[PDB]
Write a protein that binds this ligand. Structure first.
Ligand code: 2U4
Length: 502
């Protein structure tokens, strides 16, 4: 009977062929699959022991973050009604129905037994009847469309009726809050950028729903969370953090066989200026870009061979994105994300000890793909996204070492946040499986970034500031904001900027 364990030693699950301390089904499945590829059906029989890269504390932080974040978003959009309406049915029968219902993401099924002007009485699977306050029901305004909502409910009867099958969430003070299972989905992945080990993975709201692992299976458009790769290529192909690029509309042609306006490359990056991103790619040329980009972990077959590439219209997985961002985090090295740390035998003999490519402090040396100075300047700029840009909500963590980037696809069809420090790389996706707008007022920063912040808050709790150390070969010089070139003394507006020795 296959036993899957976390790095810290907690039992995730067991697999066999004809009690979990840590709930990590997405991780569990990844191990089961990997083991089967390695040993066959004999993996389930022999009693092997798999030791994963995940840490229990971090795993539950991820789990909670995604759940809370999906619930927060869901409520903002209203109530979509009960799961079942069982009026006139006996308590014994209600208990019968409830018996075949399961908890989905800490959200327990309950049947409304009574509706009072003060609240509701609900029965759980156990048969226990408990009160639910009108306060926890006040949010339950009618959902009409991802953009339209009904009026605020004025009494519990407006929201629920006896026989209604609802959801209740227990709190730290034993009380039950009136909830609903979100229709939106999310994906969280956190890595150690040193070797590419997955420290936490969440492939949806509940495995307890579908077994689909959106962290590794779902290919979504990264939008602006992709720009760094274009800008990194820029820094490595003639441009500088100072390079002035006109943010203005782009006229275009086909011929046989926007404010700001001209701004520094750094300004454009934290400000997600698409016109700049197009012009940079233009100068770089599609091919050169793709060849540079793929080296980060992306597949040539996912990268659009046109202008749209600059806008992040590629189809990628949160694991691919996280794997790639790790390049900037670890100072320029390609790491291969992994989940099996150890495979032990029946008796305890070590059958497998993962030796991944590792960044410098026998182990496999990690290949360097980009200039250490590139990784440093790139980090510098991406920290501004938190400091000045779209990541201002992440300043709440009171940390200096944070670098990141929000991403919002057209019509808010996807919401992203990808970021790090030298400790962890965390990639957060939010959206609908069948794409639809998350809402007019919804962005990567309003859906994903909150989840990300919650998780990074916990992960980096007792962690001191850890950013990349300045590598040899960087120079900070005064620049004329108007010319983008070295500023003579007495230049108004002159500012300092880092550069690779020209
Ligand atoms: C990058 O993803 C690029 C720019 O938009 N990116 C983000 C949204 C963000 C911002 O641009 O700063 N943002 C707003 O525009 C905005 C307006 C507003 O009134 C309030 O209150 C807040 C915000 C806000 O946070 C980001 O997360 O970084 N996006 C795109 O290029 C694509 N679509 O753009 C829109 C704006 C979402 C759109 O509907 O057109 C895109 C890239 S691939 C694809 N299919 N679309």
């Amino acid at each position: 009977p296959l036993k899957v364990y976390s790095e810290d030693g907690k039992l995730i699950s067991e697999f066999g062929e004809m009690t979990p301390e840590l709930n990590a089904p997405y991780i569990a499945e990844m191990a089961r699959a990997e083991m089967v590829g390695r040993y066959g059906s004999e993996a389930y029989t022999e009693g092997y022991k798999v030791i994963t890269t995940v840490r229990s504390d971090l795993q539950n932080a991820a789990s909670q973050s995604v759940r809370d974040g999906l619930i927060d978003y869901d409520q903002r959009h209203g109530y979509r009604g009960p799961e079942t309406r069982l009026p006139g049915q006996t308590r014994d029968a209600w208990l019968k129905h409830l018996g075949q219902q399961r908890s989905i993401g800490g959200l327990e099924p309950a049947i409304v037994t009574q509706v009072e002007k003060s609240g509701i009485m609900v029965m759980t699977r156990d048969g226990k009847e408990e009160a639910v306050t009108w306060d926890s029901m006040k949010w339950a305004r009618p959902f009409l469309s991802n953009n339209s909502m009904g009026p605020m409910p004025r009494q519990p009867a407006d929201v629920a009726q006896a026989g209604d099958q609802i959801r209740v969430q227990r709190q730290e003070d034993g009380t039950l809050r009136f909830v609903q299972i979100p229709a939106a989905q999310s994906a969280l992945i956190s890595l150690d950028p040193k070797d590419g080990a997955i420290r936490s993975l969440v492939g949806g709201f509940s495995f307890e729903q579908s077994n689909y692992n959106r962290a590794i299976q779902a290919k979504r458009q990264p939008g602006s969370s992709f720009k760094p790769f274009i800008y990194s290529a820029a820094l490595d192909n003639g441009f500088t953090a100072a390079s002035l690029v006109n943010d203005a509309p782009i006229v275009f042609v086909d011929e046989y066989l926007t404010f700001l306006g001209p701004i520094p490359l750094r300004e454009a990056l934290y400000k997600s200026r698409n016109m700049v991103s197009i012009r940079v790619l233009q100068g770089l040329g599609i091919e050169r870009a793709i060849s540079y980009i793929t080296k980060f972990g992306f597949q040539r077959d996912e990268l659009p061979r046109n202008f749209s590439l600059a806008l992040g219209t590629a189809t990628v997985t949160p694991m691919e994105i996280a794997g790639a961002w790790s390049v900037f985090a670890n100072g320029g090295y390609k790491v291969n994300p992994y989940v099996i740390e150890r495979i032990e035998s029946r008796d305890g003999q070590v059958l497998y000890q993962a030796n991944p490519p590792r960044v410098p402090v026998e182990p496999t040396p990690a290949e360097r793909i980009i200039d250490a100075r590139t990784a440093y300047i790139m980090t510098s700029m991406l920290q501004d996204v938190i400091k000045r840009g779209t990541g201002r909500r992440a300043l709440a963590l009171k940390r200096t070492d944070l670098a990141g980037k929000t991403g919002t696809t057209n019509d808010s069809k996807d919401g992203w946040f990808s970021g790090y420090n030298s400790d962890y790389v965390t990639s957060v996706w939010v959206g609908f499986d069948q794409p639809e707008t998350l809402g007019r007022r919804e962005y990567g920063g309003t859906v994903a970034l909150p989840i990300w912040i919650r998780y990074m808050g916990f992960a980096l709790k007792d962690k001191p500031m850890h950013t990349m150390a300045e590598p040899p070969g960087i120079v900070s010089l005064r620049i004329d904001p108007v010319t983008g070139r070295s500023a003579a003394p007495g230049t108004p507006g002159a500012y300092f900027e880092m550069f690779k020795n020209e």
